[PDB]
Amino acid sequence: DTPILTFMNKLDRDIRDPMELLDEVENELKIGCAPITWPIGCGKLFKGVYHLYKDETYLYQSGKGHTIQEVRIVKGLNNPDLDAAVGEDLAQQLRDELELVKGASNEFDKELFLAGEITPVFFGTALGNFGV
RNA sequence: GGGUUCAGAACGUCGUGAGACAGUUCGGUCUCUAUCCGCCACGGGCGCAGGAGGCUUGAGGGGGGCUCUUCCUAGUACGAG
Numbered sequence: 620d621t622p623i624l625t626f627m628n629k630l631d632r633d634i635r636d637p638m639e640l641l642d643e644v645e646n647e648l649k650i651g652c653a654p655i656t657w658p659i660g661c662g663k664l665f666k667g668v669y670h671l672y673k674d675e676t677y678l679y680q681s682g683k684g685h686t687i688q689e690v691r692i693v694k695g696l697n698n699p700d701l702d703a704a705v706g707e708d709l710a711q712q713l714r715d716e717l718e719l720v721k722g723a724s725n726e727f728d729k730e731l732f733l734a735g736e737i738t739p740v741f742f743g744t745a746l747g748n749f750g751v
Numbered sequence: 752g753g754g755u756u757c758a759g760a761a762c763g764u765c766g767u768g769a770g771a772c773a774g775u776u777c778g779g780u781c782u783c784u785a786u787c788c789g790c791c792a793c794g795g796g797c798g799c800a801g802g803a804g805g806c807u808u809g810a811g812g813g814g815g816g817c818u819c820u821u822c823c824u825a826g827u828a829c830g831a832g
Binding site for chain 2: 629631632633662663681682746
């Protein structure tokens, strides 16, 4: 029952779904999920994730793994610039979709993380360098 | 004018012989002047329902259209690999 952070590879293309996801580790596996960062578009239009304990959006770039694409952080949450660079609908879309995160999962607990029972959950794709 | 299709001449060859065999072999004169149609271009004559100097519309003609590699999407639809 030793710690074990979670990771979601393949953030370059589309995906089945962040909801029922971590949800099978509660029935079969048996471990609570604590999302520290969420999606911002799958596929080519992919736009990375966003940290929850840092309130700041990471912006990924197309094609890049050997030379990590420059890093760009748009802190300001619903702040327009984020919305504009990641698209309105989309930027507050996740906003409403992110709202879904407020309900159906927990926050981040350092002590339950090790005390065996939970797992920190990370999101990102290696082939991208974005999310490592 | 290399192949073949004139003389020489040579072998295999058939013919007694002269000779001969879409059998071989080496050798062997390709004719300065475009009149008429055509065609490439270039003028001179008259005409365009007044003399002129220009700049012009464009019916109708012509010209030209070709293709390869590699990178990005994207190691992603797809695929167990």
